[PDB]
């Protein structure tokens, strides 16, 4: 029953900003850590953000630092991907991965495509 749903993707030109929210239910959302992973076209996955239970941490991997930041509302079970400098190595489709208790992704969402032009 567990569902994890991904929006505010489409198509931006290199620049400007984004906002991707998802939205989760089925499960208690404040007690599971968040992980933002992307695929480019053709590629392989790519981890790049995690954002803990409360949201006091936030890891970044890098080519991206500053230009994104990941945020966490519990009050109405969401998850944010506010995406600042965008640029062409970032089209690629997001999932929103909530992390296994024992440590793996286990629930993943149906992605949102971002394409930059």
């Known amino acids: 029953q567990v569902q994890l749903v991904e929006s505010g993707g489409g198509v931006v030109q290199p620049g400007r900003s984004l906002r991707l929210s998802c939205a989760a239910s089925?499960?208690?959302?404040?007690?599971?850590?968040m992980h933002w992973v992307r695929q480019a076209p053709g590629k392989g996955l790519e981890w790049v953000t995690f954002?803990?239970?409360?949201?006091?941490?936030?890891y970044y991997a890098d080519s991206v630092k500053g230009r994104f930041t990941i945020s966490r509302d519990n009050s109405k079970n969401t998850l944010y991907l506010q995406m600042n400098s965008l640029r062409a190595e970032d089209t690629a489709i997001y999932y929103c991965?909530?992390?296994?208790?024992?440590?793996?992704?286990?629930?993943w969402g149906q992605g949102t495509l971002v394409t930059v032009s």
């Open positions: 954002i803990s239970y409360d949201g006091n941490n936030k």
């Open positions: 991965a909530r992390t296994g208790w024992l440590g793996p992704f286990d629930y």
């Open positions: 089925g499960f208690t959302f404040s007690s599971y850590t």
